[PDB]
Structure 1
Amino acid sequence: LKSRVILAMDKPLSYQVLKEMENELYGIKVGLPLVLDLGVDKTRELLIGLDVEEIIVDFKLADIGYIMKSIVERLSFANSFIAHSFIGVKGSLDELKRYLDANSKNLYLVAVMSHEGWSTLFADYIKNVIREISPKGIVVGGTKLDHITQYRRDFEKMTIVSPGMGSQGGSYGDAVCAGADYEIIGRSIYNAGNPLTALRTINKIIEDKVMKC
């Protein structure tokens, strides 16, 4: 089958390794630590040499609209961007969404985070923001499986991406089983002795889990 993995590239991997990974990943999530290390120019060059379904730039955008737009205009190599939902619509997400739509870029909104300290106190407000903005997708922690299932019910056509797998405790495939489309995986791949073997192993586990699912 086809991979459900989005590589969280928060640290550089060699072109050699990434080249082999191309056809065994759904996408790559480009993180701020990576871009700070390589610079925008070299980040773009790196990705140009790669062929994956989706390149997602994730700077966890959470500012006024002007600043979020200023950031994304500098990163045209991405297909999609991640922003927070909690910042709200007027003068923040509305401006960003307008710009991204005008430039044929996708938006993902952070709905529920993976760490224990995240509050789900404001799900009604968060859902309204999401419903209002109408992003391509949302981020829902793979450590919060019940939230994944809840969000999939409340948003049937939404792309759901789920991080917190491996390092943070999520067992590979549980998020997809609970309703996510893709699982975001960072350290368990890029810090592995052999990141390629790590990816191939994970793809197997996910395949197995989904079937028992």
Structure 2
Amino acid sequence: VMDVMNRLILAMDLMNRDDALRVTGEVREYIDTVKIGYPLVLSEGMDIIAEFRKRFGCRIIADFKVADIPETNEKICRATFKAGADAIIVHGFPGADSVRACLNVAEEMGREVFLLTEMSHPGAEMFIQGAADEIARMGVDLGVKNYVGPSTRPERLSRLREIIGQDSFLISPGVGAQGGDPGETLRFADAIIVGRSIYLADNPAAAAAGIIESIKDL
């Protein structure tokens, strides 16, 4: 599995190139893994991935929550890996064929797929939660090794961990801004994803240092 420095992944969702670069560079010493999503990519272009690689020695996870039909998923994955992303996050709710398509491209292109089972926001309780256990089981049966679960619902994250086993890799968003706690989340997740709590702080570096200090024993 990827070796995430300090078990902390930066969710760089600022939508300005200069601000995104400035902030990421300031926390550079505490993180070696950055999660880039559509807010930044649709504002600055996929070339932002290469720029982060050039400026920082950071691993890139594209949080695109792929959720299309199989054929389209393949194209999305190919475009994303061509851009230099190390891994891509895919939605499990659209079913096995859609996930398999992503795994096929990842295998062919030598990259990784992360399966998003249950989401962290309140609305996730409406339809995703009830299917999350089966989505995880589906992922396990498909050979998925990397997963995404909610920091906001410890009991759910714990169940996800059980389903995928200790060997699987698990990252979890919803820490900070959404209410999740760093330490509690790392009881089940291999690494935590943190966005606003860091990038909106007056001193992003200090915010990141503070989070790491709080989980030092972990």
TM above 0.5, yes or no, is: yes
**Native 8 Å contact 1:106 1:135 kept in 2:** no
| Structure 2: distance between partners of 1:69 and 1:135 | 16
Amino acid at match of 1:34: L
| Structure 1: distance between partners of 2:136 and 2:120 | 17
Name the counterpart of 2:10.
7
**How far is 1:14 from its partner?**
4.8
**How far is 1:15 from its partner?**
3.4
**How far is 1:71 from its partner?**
1.5
Say which is worse superposed, 158-167 or 199-208, in terms of deviation.
199-208
Amino acid at match of 1:55: I
Amino acid at match of 1:81: I
The CA deviation string for residues 7-44 of structure 1, in whole angstroms up to 9 with x for no partner, is 00111445354234233114111010000111112342
* 1:56 equivalenced with 2:65 (yes/no): no
Name the counterpart of 1:82.
89
Supply the RMSD in Å over aligned alpha carbons.
1.9
| Structure 2: distance between partners of 1:26 and 1:146 | 29
Amino acid at match of 1:86: F
TM-score (norm 2): 0.87
Name the counterpart of 1:160.
170
**Native 8 Å contact 2:120 2:153 kept in 1:** yes
**How far is 1:81 from its partner?**
0.4
| Structure 2: distance between partners of 1:72 and 1:30 | 14
Mapping of residues 192-207 of structure 1, within 5 Å: 192-207=201-216
Equivalenced residues, count = 206
Say which is worse superposed, 3-12 or 65-74, in terms of deviation.
65-74
* 1:110 equivalenced with 2:116 (yes/no): yes
Mapping of residues 133-144 of structure 1, within 5 Å: 133-144=142-153
* 1:172 equivalenced with 2:182 (yes/no): yes
The CA deviation string for residues 72-119 of structure 1, in whole angstroms up to 9 with x for no partner, is 2222211100001111112x1212211111111111111111112213
| Structure 1: distance between partners of 2:179 and 2:130 | 23
| Structure 2 alignment gaps of length 5 or more | none
Name the counterpart of 2:31.
25
* 1:101 equivalenced with 2:104 (yes/no): no
